[PDB]
């Protein structure tokens, strides 16, 4: 498991919109945490999400220190927590917050960090990560007293000393935010030039989503240059279809988890069948073929499991419409083979300088017939906010085999006169936009999960999601104007029947 | 789309028993290729009628034996669905001969086979092959008739030869006889072959004359009866007044086996004697049975839980649609963000010249402007809508929009990997440059062609057929012919057609040694 403590700052500063249309930084913080919660419910991840505030008047915590309100102890997310955080959305949200939580109250980071350590103390589950995701737009919260800063620094050093990471998701303070003053040595630096001041929602939301999730190797493999020279890498899949997680049928009365056994016994004696008592069969015509399960899972061994290197074909030959199944991402795991990262760095550097892939043969696990994959290099991309939007390593591309690639009919290639191409260039340029990878969000998941949340609180009707992936047809027509008519009279006959 | 009528015509005259050590005899290579063909035509349970015709034998068996003509023409199997009798024949009871036969007479015989046997049978395609080494004299008179009935009986062809149309250890099926290592009779035959192939198909003929190695690492044997795709009609709409009536096909649809291993009892070898029981009890301790009426349909939500108008509150879509969102630079629709286990090619519908004009305009505008449509797509009314990039693709033969689905925000998974190039513990040594650069220059699978400008690829691994299919089919065949014996190891044309040309390994031998000496690796 993994516990994280959104340790929001409730001081007066977060409530001060800097005279702009954007949201007050406390409000970005709350919309961000609500977004993290709903997200961690989409993936069905079981991690633990606590919400804390510091700098307020009241307090609801373990030891009852001053101005430290633990709004939700360490527990899984649910409908109630999402709605409770939603209550602080918008200007009315800040209004409600300043009613049972007065702002602008002195504090000490040492005590709040001690409170968080104690939040981690009570739980007992084996959690792999514990991070306190501090939100602050105050460079020197202890600028008026050295003792407070000293205790806070010592405390943070202790938290890191016990295996608790200490993030810092500073927000947009006027005059910049110089992390060097007070937060130089509070954050666990596992170098690592730190992020930029989050300005609006989306920047902070992406930085949060990039600092909370932790890489899970979809597998660990050996990339082999020969019989001997083998490096050890990890295949992380950076994208996979997040399916609408499947229902759990529960005991009708008490609503408890239930079991679904797999008992396969004889229709005569009833004794359950050891796997050794059954042979695997296949029928062709009137003929039948029988062979043992080991010999239907070993008419496959080609390789050991892993990537084994075979050539360096230049990238121009790796076409773009030869796509088979989602691509993975290969990155050195220098834990196993001391020194693998070095040779991987060399190979990436000089695969980039020469614009050349590395065609390999990939067998995921034992007893699998290989594909031909191509390790296409790709170099880091520190975006304008200092996020990492294209991580360094070898993308891994799956190349089809001639059984895959289907052959399509064709009718005589008819081409249009450059007049028509020009007018369609005009229509094209009226719809340009800047697609970015994390732009759209599924209708079915969001519709179904709002349906669920409504059914999770006995509401009348659910919150229908306003669709994004639809064409904004009215506005888009009004954008083109009469261009479409020009094109239609250009190409279609007067008496065309497009329906 | 219904049936094909193939007629293999093997040559087995004495010339093909020329077994040069290190090189498979042409006869055994023909055996390997026809095993590949008929395996994948029986086991995939296709409905193609194969007829094998063997010439080169000592006997005679055909409808044209009269007049003491067409000697060494043994019709081994007339047109019928292929079964395991044929697959046993191909390697047990089909043996070389001492004659040398006229393969043009073999063509005329096969033409007779197809034109006669296929009288009461409706066939969409008619196909023929020849597996000859071209070492027999022949008379070209009836050639005039051959073509004069080929196109008029609507029959294709395909030629296989032990030598290509363009040295060292002859890896069968690998990725390499010399065209100057053949005889004059072979050259004359090959000229006749090229003549007939051109006369059938224009310049496209000389792509139909495959080697025997080359045919073991291609789907060329099936190339001319492969099932036509399915046209998915739809309407690519921009706005609501720009509707382009299109047809989309699947292109790169991964291929997997169509028969699952049924489980049967190890002794009586039947399935019905087995059943699977999956009954519900409490999963926690105190495992009590819970009835179906005691079980209802419920979803999880973080910690809370929900039970489950209810059945009818399923999401709704607006029907089959291929509409646009908005076009964007082709440098932002990267490729590492593709989803879906397929790819589509979108053509303008057939019989719609105007629609073709419109879509060609769209494609060319996209390509010149260097940017790609981000369309929305939903297979049918009951489908989950998805947004995918439709980007241009113009071939000299056709223009199309290649569609590939794209992620959503709740599909991606932004991680943060530490930097490599900026790292300090892996400092840039001269070893980096010299060693890895030499290695890369060695193992290149591309070479600039004879014209020093353009680039050929040595090892086109988007063209091999899937090894697991022939491995599986070999093993099933072996257990259908040797029930008492273990599975064979993997054949060698396979283990060769899944390996780089030996030139690569030979050139790379030394850089790899340099790396191993210079980049110390040690496991924990």
Author numbering:
A (entry chain A): 35 to 224, 229 to 537
B (entry chain B): 5 to 170, 180 to 189, 192 to 323, 327 to 542
Share the article's original sentences:
Nonhomologous end joining (NHEJ) is a DNA repair mechanism that religates double‐strand DNA breaks to maintain genomic integrity during the entire cell cycle. Here, we describe intramolecular interactions of the Ku70 C‐terminal domain, known as the SAP domain. Using single‐particle cryo‐electron microscopy, mass spectrometric analysis of intermolecular cross‐linking and molecular modelling simulations, we captured variable positions of the SAP domain depending on DNA binding.
The second position, which was observed in both apo and DNA‐bound states, was found below the DNA aperture, close to the helical arm of Ku70.
